[PDB]
Design a protein around this ligand. Structure first.
Ligand SMILES: [Zn+2]
Lengths: 717, 23, 687, 225, 62, 81, 232
């Protein structure tokens, strides 16, 4: 739902209102019905309610970065002149309430109303089409309110007490309604550990097995739980049929719960559940006592001592510059390290001095908003500030914003503040330019086939193997392994296959191969999809927004381009590196590569660097010429030692990176083949996006890379 | 007192530093 | 918008224009702060749009020499001795010396307390330096900031990002019906209001002979009389109400240079850009989600955030090819009910309230017979109305406008007034509206804390204090520690101390926290005014102590604690809130971003003649632009029919838009989209 | 432990402020009773206020009267502070004529039969030698707060100036409860309601109006289905 | 050429388009956006576009 | 196994995607059926061969889109891809 | 004042002992004024009888385990606390519950003295082990709301008697919310939704009616002061 003003709806639905005004005989003809609407006769307010009944509208906020920037809603006539937006869709629009405006579009045709009702409805788009993780979820007040009641407090009133002496066990209630009454009178606290007999909540699958196990828990069967009343009230919203969770509701916990709900439970249930969560989170955020005062801003106890130790060290380095023992370019770096150590000591003092009852710490620990760096600048110290040059000033801002900056400290802080504001416009400009380039390069990439039937795919590193044994989960599972589809049956050491070919890799289906010992899977990819133009759905995989297999006809290319271009606002490598990669430029790094596998012949000097390679099979020695300003990459030598600096005698393979930097993507193709250069580009872009906190599935990058190698040149006609 | 020159309302300043030159 | 906006606009330093630079030829080095801008151009006040850094504001004490460079004053320190001799230095003259920071500990004789003091040096180097090296020192701590920047209390506790926004939004304040001076001030309000030029200062000393709402007469000592006329309900450049009101009464001895009357955003001679509101910092049922602001309906019932807005409408009667446009009450096919608010000339009468669509000036234009639609000629035949060769071209009230007609001005060529050639008459009508605070009106403080009104609850739903007094505004806690604008918090504390007053324990000497405070601060009455100058003023050690000795209410009990919090009651249920809440008084301004102006909607209307697409902007009754990025969202959804609908029948299509309107008013289905006219234009241009 | 029928006792502090103690009440019950009474008091207590005014020399709010120090807007803001009670419950007209010099106050108004001004010392205007003020004031009777009635909605002609009407006679209401939390067989809450009016009615009359309101309203649950 | 002339280098694309006398088959998202046709994606492809709906023989007696 | 769908979410978006192959085909099904119902409502008084009326019992002043969606949920219609 | 008419009460019966009532439509914003009041009146001011303290033969200084039965002490206390019982005596009444031999105890195997009534005879209480015997003394008292445990610490005699939480109130769980309805133009009228789940002592209808009667008396205390007019 969305709340739009009555005066807006009257003009937006003006012809429909005139139609119904001439139908109900409030107006003689359509000509006078128009005048009735223009003069706002009191009958139009009763007619307009009938008009807008179940007629969806489209809400939009510029800039429209991704497809969720325009969403369909059911209009509800509200007074006033402002548009009422749902608190959960604020993340998709990136819309704060500090003066933002939105546009409303009215679909007229039946096909447009159907597209808005089914394809564009906000309740049908909970997940991000880029990552698959939910967006309509508790974010600020909601997650704090849920974090409140799901907190286990020891000394809280009404807590459980073991039976000792003449009194029995204190703090065991027969019904959650009895616990509600006890908290009503003032005996029990909603956050106190107690034992409750529950009858309408499925126990955890751990304990449901020991109680029943043979049959699933039944609505009506009772069981004991050592929880808080607030945790029971929270679990009442999931609701029945879902295993009880006795955890503390951090944002990560709630996000995992909602992801698991989207995977297993249907869409309408997910929408109604997150609405319940919104309401409860607001209710308990009102009563969580979250407040900011000058008293809550606690200052470090050893502020003076810490800053005096580091001022002593800084004075010693300044005296080591007085005698000329330190270069002027080195004095700044030394003082920078000094103050970077000092700021860490101050923040560490803050962490232990601050209690967990302090609301400033509660807000940040909940994960709703704010960093602890912000709290450190708030109470501890600002630290080293940046001048418009770029390097840190050799003198930090020792005072905190609670203490109060001096004149010169404020003046030097502005140096960084203003330029941080200034370069943002240019960075967003280049980001949007790259976004529209990515749009035009993949605009005609549509899913036209169900299955191209090609058994080709690619090997994905599921899990790394620890040196002692066992298994270690790989960091690239979320972006490169999940939501994929198989092109080869996974075979463990036994003859039985765990997951069939062509099965969507769900969440438990990854643990199925994890607990099976196999650490490599061959999956279908959009790169290996052999089709005339578009790509088949089987090689694409699971649609991140729909949670299922991609339907035929979905413009996956535009979705991928928007998925890459939306986080482009958060870059430094950086954004020009992404541009170097997507434009197939000869990179700045210009790292060399091994054209032929064989034996290394390092003929290093100081005037220059030269390296030859003796081919392992036939051929002749291949000689290079590189500047001594680079350094060799620690190549995983055949010795199984990854930190093997490339010296002569190492056994490097074909297409192996020699020195550090960025290998020319044009040469990787003419060395290893079109199959490998695409993987290189994919994970090279994924590194830039991962070094910033942005998780983009490799599917969307592969969609773009497929369009770069669609063309070949002609050597002979 | 603060700005005791035109006859304005008496706003009480928390000032520790004297004003050597007026605006 | 307000006097401060005009003062700032008069103190602008723009790098754009002829002789300067083009916007496309400006790197990130022309816009950032330069160390020579100290005391000359403000490093805070600058827009955050495309003109960031290109437009600055002159510092307070700065001036210009006849060469063109900006000079700033400094106190000359001979040999570690502070002298009252002040000299102005240019930018390069300042580099040939070293100057000490304004907040230096100084002996009563003038000698620096510490040998090494914080000193600025050429190429922007800040370091400790011996006392015998200081040649000059700053005049005031606020020497570097602008006038609007110096008006932010506790500015040293706000990051430059939000401080810039506070200074830039102070210029966007709207003059309210009545104005209140802020409890927490900086001292700059008075001089800002006076030098702005919107108040009425007395040129010569004397006594008030006759005071009226229209003029003020001053009888001087020599014997001459000077009369100052009040500017009452005048439309400003941006539609705000510039209204001056007398302050003095009959027979009041007034000195020279004293404010005898003040205009908009002024209270007793001080900048009153907003109101003192009782603020509580707590989330409330989600209605204050990420900077959304909940308001008490009291502010609506008592016109606390109500402002007057005046619009100017204008129309002319010209000479046409088939005759002359005439302004007359006789308009074809109009009842005597719509023309009831018009006089005998066809002009709306003074005092008549007019909604949108009402006729302000009845003008008819003669249209030729060869310009008639076939259906229109048949309709003229089937109604027998001959001699209606004129058509309606009257001045009507635009959509979204409503108020009282306060003034009419008529210029006629016949009346001997000079009009542009081809015009016989000209009429200007002034319409004034009294806008109360509404849902969505953008409020903000002085620390860059902006937000729209999310909900105006009834006065009984508000979280009220122990003595039943409900709060006026509910600010969300989550949007506080991110922005690093703790000033609004600190103000909120000091504000409360200004609302109640304080009394320091005089027994057993002066306490150890109020030793630095002036003796005037030890005792305060309720609703007292205080100054917190920029980079000076109240310290946290003194504010914490002030919170402990707050004055009790009329019943005798203290409401807030030494932590600055008080116990609140949920007005919707009755149970007290489980934890104390920071409650104080904050200065909130009504910015010129009201939903009464920013709301717009369109079914159909005018289309640009060339491209045959709907007009742009609200003033031209245009529609929203479904831009290039939005079509990508449409395509990513796969909603083909919605996109095709937007591109043709809803907008460009010449015949598709008409048959769609017909299909709606007939109850039929929506027809099939045609070919856009803009594409035809593209082909004819390629030809 | 068993019921005792509650008792309401009145204490007076001034002529427009009274406390009301209700006891005994069940534990946890006093806060909600105090809140319900406070909400009905701050909103739905009947009272009289001025609907519109009419000054002879003016046609709208945004102008001045010759001789008076305050413009018409400031005069209307001063009239918004007026407290008045009406017996007619129908539109009636008060009149005010005053020739300067001198101060026009609320006592200078001559109310017709039924209505009366409750603070004759309120400042309205300052008039000099050339000042003459002639004002009509239409007083009706409603409840709560109503915005100024539009001239298009009413039949009032141009000269009439509508004003916002604040019909609530109560000024400030609060409460505090005392809870007997001694662990024993007998626990009870004592409610202390605090009511302050604006001399239009006495506090006990406003509490009685709120009591009739809530009796009639809670009577909706007693009727069976 | 129509999808390229609306991206970058309008003149450089139009010149070579007129020289090589290229004819554009209007089958693409950008092109159909310009000319007002249904985009060949989502509900615009011929699979979902040309679909007939009829009641399943059964009908009410009234 | 869910709360009663209120407003535009009825019929449920999960059960409607069962009688259809994809999200994009349900749009066409419902839209063309809604056009049929609208043409029946506008050709009931005039013209023969009027389109087949609403198969389910319609609510008072119910939009043809909602009626078509309900009867799609009730398995009263066919399709032809 | 002015007339405020058409506020009606409707009931939807979810279960035989659980109902949702709607008061609709109310003036803005009386839904919150009489919402929490109605809820607390239901939950804390309806006369009902419940178990105050018990005493199990064979349990003196342990309170850890009862020999001869599978359930321990607190587990017995729990399902004894949920025992519904209506007493017309208005005084503390002692009932005895005894059963021997292997099997199962029920709330029907209890013997109720004249005046009291057990409404859930099929409620499980304990499982009797082989050759098991159980004797227990229950005390039933009238009251209103929920009195905490260890509040009857002084009532229990110094002889293996344990006080328990006494759920006197016949209603178990009441919640309420407020939505928006509109007759005429403005769309901010209050609609109060009460969800009441009670025991089988009385139906939700009579519980709401009793709360209404008590509240009418409570506010008639204030109505009696002046009998001034007010819009109905
Ligand atoms: Zn494929």
């Amino acid at each position: 739902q969305c709340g739009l003003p009555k005066l807006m709806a009257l003009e937006l639905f003006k012809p429909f209102v005139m139609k119904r005004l001439v139908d109900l005989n409030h107006a003689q003809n359509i000509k006078s019905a128009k005048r009735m609407v223009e003069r706002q006769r009191p009958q139009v307010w009763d007619v307009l309610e009938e008009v807008i009944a179940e007629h969806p509208v489209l809400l939009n906020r510029a800039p429209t970065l991704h497809r969720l920037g325009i969403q369909a809603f059911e209009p509800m006539l509200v007074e006033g002149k402002a548009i009422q937006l749902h608190p959960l869709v604020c993340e998709a629009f990136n819309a704060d309430f500090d003066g933002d405006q939105m546009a409303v579009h009215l679909p007229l045709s039946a096909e447009a109303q159907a597209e808005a009702r089914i394809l564009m409805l906000s309740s049908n788009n909970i997940l991000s089409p880029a990552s698959g993780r939910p967006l309509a979820m508790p974010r600020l007040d909601m997650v704090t309110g849920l974090y409140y009641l799901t907190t286990e407090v020891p000394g809280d009133t009404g807590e459980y007490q073991p039976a000792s002496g003449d009194h029995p066990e204190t703090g065991v209630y027969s019904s959650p309604a009895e616990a509600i009454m006890a908290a009503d009178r003032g005996v029990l606290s909603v956050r106190a550990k107690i034992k409750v007999r529950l009858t309408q909540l499925r126990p955890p699958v751990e304990i449901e097995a020991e109680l029943f196990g043979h049959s699933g828990w039944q609505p009506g069967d009772a069981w004991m739980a050592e929880t808080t009343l607030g945790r029971v009230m929270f679990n009442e919203l999931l609701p029945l049929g879902y295993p009880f969770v006795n955890k503390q509701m951090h944002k990560k916990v709630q996000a995992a719960i909602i992801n698991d709900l989207a995977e297993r439970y249907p869409m309408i249930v997910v929408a109604q559940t997150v609405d319940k969560l919104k309401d409860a989170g607001f209710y308990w955020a009102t009563r969580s006592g979250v407040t900011v005062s000058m008293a809550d801003v606690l200052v470090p106890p050893r502020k003076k001592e810490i800053l005096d130790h580091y001022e002593e060290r800084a004075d010693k380095v300044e005296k080591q510059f007085q005698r000329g023992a330190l270069n002027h370019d080195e004095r700044n770096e030394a003082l920078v390290e000094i103050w970077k150590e000092a700021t860490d000591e101050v923040g560490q003092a803050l962490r232990e001095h601050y209690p967990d009852d302090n609301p400033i710490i509660t807000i940040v620990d909940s994960g709703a908003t704010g960093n602890f760096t912000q709290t450190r600048t708030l109470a501890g110290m600002k630290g080293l500030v940046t001048n418009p040059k770029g390097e840190f000033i050799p003198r930090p801002v020792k005072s905190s914003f609670r203490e109060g900056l001096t004149v010169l400290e404020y003046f030097i802080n502005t140096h960084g503040a203003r330029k941080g504001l200034a370069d943002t416009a240019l960075r967003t400009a280049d980001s949007g330019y790259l976004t529209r380039r990515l749009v035009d390069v993949s605009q005609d990439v549509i899913v036209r086939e169900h299955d191209c039937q090609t058994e080709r795919g690619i090997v994905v590193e599921l899990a790394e193997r620890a040196p002692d044994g066992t298994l270690i989960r790989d960091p690239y599972i979320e972006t490169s392994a999940y939501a994929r589809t198989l092109g080869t049956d996974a075979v463990d050491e036994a003859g039985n296959v765990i997951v069939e070919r062509g099965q969507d890799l769900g969440d438990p289906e990854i643990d199925a191969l994890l607990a099976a010992g196999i650490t490599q899977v061959k999956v279908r990819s959009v790169l290996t999809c052999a089709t005339s133009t578009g790509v088949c759905a089987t090689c694409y995989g699971r649609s991140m927004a729909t949670g299922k297999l991609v339907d035929i006809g979905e413009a996956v290319g535009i979705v991928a381009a928007q998925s890459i271009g939306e986080p482009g606002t958060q870059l430094t490598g950086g954004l020009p590196r992404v541009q170097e990669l997507f434009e197939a430029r000869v990179p700045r790094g210009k790292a060399p590569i091994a054209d032929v596998t064989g034996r290394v012949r390092l003929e290093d000097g100081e005037r220059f660097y030269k390296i030859t390679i003796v081919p392992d099979d036939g051929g002749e020695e291949v000689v290079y010429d590189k500047i001594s300003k680079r350094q060799r990459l620690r190549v995983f030598k055949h010795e199984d030692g990854s930190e093997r600096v490339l010296s002569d005698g190492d056994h490097v393979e074909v297409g192996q990176q020699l020195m550090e930097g960025s290998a020319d993507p044009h040469e990787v193709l003419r060395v290893q083949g079109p199959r490998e250069v695409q993987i290189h580009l994919v994970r090279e872009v994924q590194e830039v996006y991962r070094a910033q906190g942005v998780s983009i599935h490799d599917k969307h990058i592969e969609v773009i890379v497929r369009q770069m190698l669609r063309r070949v040149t002609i050597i002979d006609s | 007192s603060n700005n005791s020159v035109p006859g304005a309302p008496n706003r009480v300043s928390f000032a520790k530093l004297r004003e050597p030159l007026e605006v | 918008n307000n006097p401060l906006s005009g003062l700032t606009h008069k103190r602008r330093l723009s790098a754009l224009g002829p002789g300067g630079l083009s916007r496309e030829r400006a790197g990130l080095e022309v816009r950032d702060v330069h160390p020579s801008h100290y005391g000359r151009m403000c490093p805070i006040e600058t827009p955050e749009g495309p003109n960031i850094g290109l437009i600055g504001s002159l510092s307070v004490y700065a001036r210009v020499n006849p060469f063109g460079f900006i000079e700033t004053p400094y106190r000359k320190v001979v040999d570690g001795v502070v002298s009252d001799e002040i000299v102005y230095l240019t930018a390069d003259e300042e580099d040939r010396h070293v100057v000490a920071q304004a907040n230096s500990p100084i002996d009563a004789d003038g000698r620096f307390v510490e040998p090494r003091v914080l000193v600025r040096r050429k190429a922007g180097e800040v370091e400790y330096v011996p006392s015998s090296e200081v040649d000059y020192m700053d005049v005031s701590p606020r020497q570097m900031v602008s006038v609007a920047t110096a008006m932010i209390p506790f500015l040293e506790h706000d990051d430059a990002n939000r401080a810039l926004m506070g200074a830039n939004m102070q210029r966007q304040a709207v003059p309210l019906v009545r104005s209140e001076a802020p409890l927490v001030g900086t001292g700059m309000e008075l001089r800002a209001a006076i030098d702005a030029g919107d108040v009425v200062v007395a040129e010569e000393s004397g006594v008030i002979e006759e005071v009226s709402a229209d003029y003020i007469t001053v009888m001087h000592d020599n014997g001459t009389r000077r009369t100052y006329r009040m500017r009452k309900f005048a439309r400003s450049n941006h539609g705000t109400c510039a209204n001056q009101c007398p302050i003095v009464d009959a027979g009041d001895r007034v000195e020279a240079g004293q404010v005898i009357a003040d205009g908009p955003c002024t209270d007793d001679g001080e900048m009153a850009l907003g109101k003192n509101l009782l603020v509580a910092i707590m989330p409330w049922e989600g209605h204050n989600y990420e900077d959304a602001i909940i308001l008490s309906n009291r502010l609506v019932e008592e016109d606390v955030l109500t402002s007057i807005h005046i619009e100017e409408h204008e129309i002319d009667a010209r000479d046409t090819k088939l005759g002359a446009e005439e302004i007359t009450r006789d308009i074809p096919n109009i009842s005597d009910e719509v023309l009831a608010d018009l006089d005998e000339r066809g002009i709306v009468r003074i005092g008549a309230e007019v909604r949108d669509g009402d006729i302000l000036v009845g003008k008819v234009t003669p249209k030729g017979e060869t310009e008639l639609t076939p259906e229109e000629r048949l309709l003229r035949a089937i109604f027998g109305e001959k001699a209606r060769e004129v058509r309606d071209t009257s001045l009507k009230v635009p959509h979204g406008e409503s108020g009282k007609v306060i003034g009419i001005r008529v210029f006629s060529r016949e009346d001997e007034d000079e009009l542009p050639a081809g015009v016989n008459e000209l009429v200007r009508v002034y319409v004034a509206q009294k806008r109360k605070i509404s849902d969505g009106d953008k409020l903000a403080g002085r620390h860059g804390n902006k937000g729209v009104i999310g909900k105006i609850l009834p006065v009984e739903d508000m979280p009220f204090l122990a003595d039943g007094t409900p709060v006026d505004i509910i600010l969300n806690t989550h949007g506080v520690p991110r922005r690093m604008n703790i000033g609004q918090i600190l103000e909120t504390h000091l504000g409360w101390c200004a609302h109640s007053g304080w009394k320091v324990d005089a027994a057993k000497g002066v306490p150890d926290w109020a030793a630095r405070l002036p003796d005037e601060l030890l005792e305060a009455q309720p609703n007292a005014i205080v100054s917190t100058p920029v980079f000076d003023g109240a310290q946290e050690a003194e504010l914490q102590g002030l919170l402990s000795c707050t004055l009790p209410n009329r019943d005798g009990d203290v409401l807030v604690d030494a932590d600055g919090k008080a116990m609140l009651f949920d007005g919707r249920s009755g149970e007290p809130f489980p934890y104390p809440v920071t409650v104080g008084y904050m200065y909130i301004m009504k910015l010129h971003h009201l939903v009464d102006d920013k709301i717009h909607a369109r079914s159909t209307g005018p289309y640009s003649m060339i491209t045959q697409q709907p007009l742009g902007g609200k003033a031209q009754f245009g529609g929203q632009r479904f831009g290039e990025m939005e079509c990508w969202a449409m395509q990513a959804y796969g909603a083909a029919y919605t996109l095709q609908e937007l591109l043709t029948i809803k907008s460009d299509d010449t015949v598709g838009r008409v048959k769609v309107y017909e299909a709606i008013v007939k109850g039929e289905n929506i027809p099939e989209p045609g070919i856009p006219e803009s594409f035809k234009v593209l082909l004819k241009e390629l030809q | 432990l068993i019921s005792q029928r509650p008792t309401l006792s009145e204490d007076v502090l001034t002529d427009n402020r009274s406390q009301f103690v209700i006891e005994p009440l069940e534990p946890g019950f006093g806060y909600t009773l105090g809140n319900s009474l406070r909400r009905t008091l701050l909103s739905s207590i009947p009272g009289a206020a001025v609907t519109s005014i009419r000054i002879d020399g003016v046609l709208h709010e945004f102008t001045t009267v010759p001789g008076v120090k305050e413009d018409v807007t400031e005069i209307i803001l001063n009239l918004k502070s007026l407290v008045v009670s009406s017996e007619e419950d129908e539109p009636v007209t008060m009149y005010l004529r005053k020739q300067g010099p001198g101060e026009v106050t609320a006592g200078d108004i001559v109310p017709p039969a039924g209505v009366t001004v409750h603070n004759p010392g309120m400042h309205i205007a300052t008039l000099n030698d050339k000042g003459k003020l002639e004002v009509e004031l239409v007083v009706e009777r409603g409840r709560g707060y109503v915005p100024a009635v539009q001239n298009r909605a009413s039949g009032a002609e141009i000269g009439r100036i509508p004003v916002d009407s604040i019909y609530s006679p109560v000024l400030k209401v609060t409460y505090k409860v005392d809870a007997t939390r001694v662990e024993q067989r007998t626990d009870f809450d004592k409610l202390i309601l605090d009511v302050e009016t604006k001399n239009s009615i006495s506090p006990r009359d406003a509490l009685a109006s709120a009591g009739k309101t809530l009796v009639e309203l809670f009577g909706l649950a007693r009727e069976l289905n | 050429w129509l999808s390229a002339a609306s991206f970058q280098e309008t003149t450089r694309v139009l010149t070579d388009a007129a020289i090589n006398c290229r004819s554009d088959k209007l089958n693409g998202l950008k092109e159909n956006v310009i000319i007002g046709k249904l985009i060949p994606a989502g509900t615009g492809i011929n699979r979902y576009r040309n679909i007939a709906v009829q009641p399943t023989e059964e009908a009410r007696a009234a | 196994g869910y709360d009663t769908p209120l407003g535009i979410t009825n019929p449920p978006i999960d059960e409607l995607l069962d009688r259809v192959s994809s999200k994009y085909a349900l749009v066409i099904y419902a839209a063309k059926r809604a056009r049929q119902i609208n043409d029946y409502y506008n050709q009931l008084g005039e013209g023969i061969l009027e389109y087949v009326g609403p198969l389910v019992e319609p609510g008072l002043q119910e939009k043809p889109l909602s009626i078509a969606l309900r009867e799609i949920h009730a398995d009263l219609l066919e399709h032809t891809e």
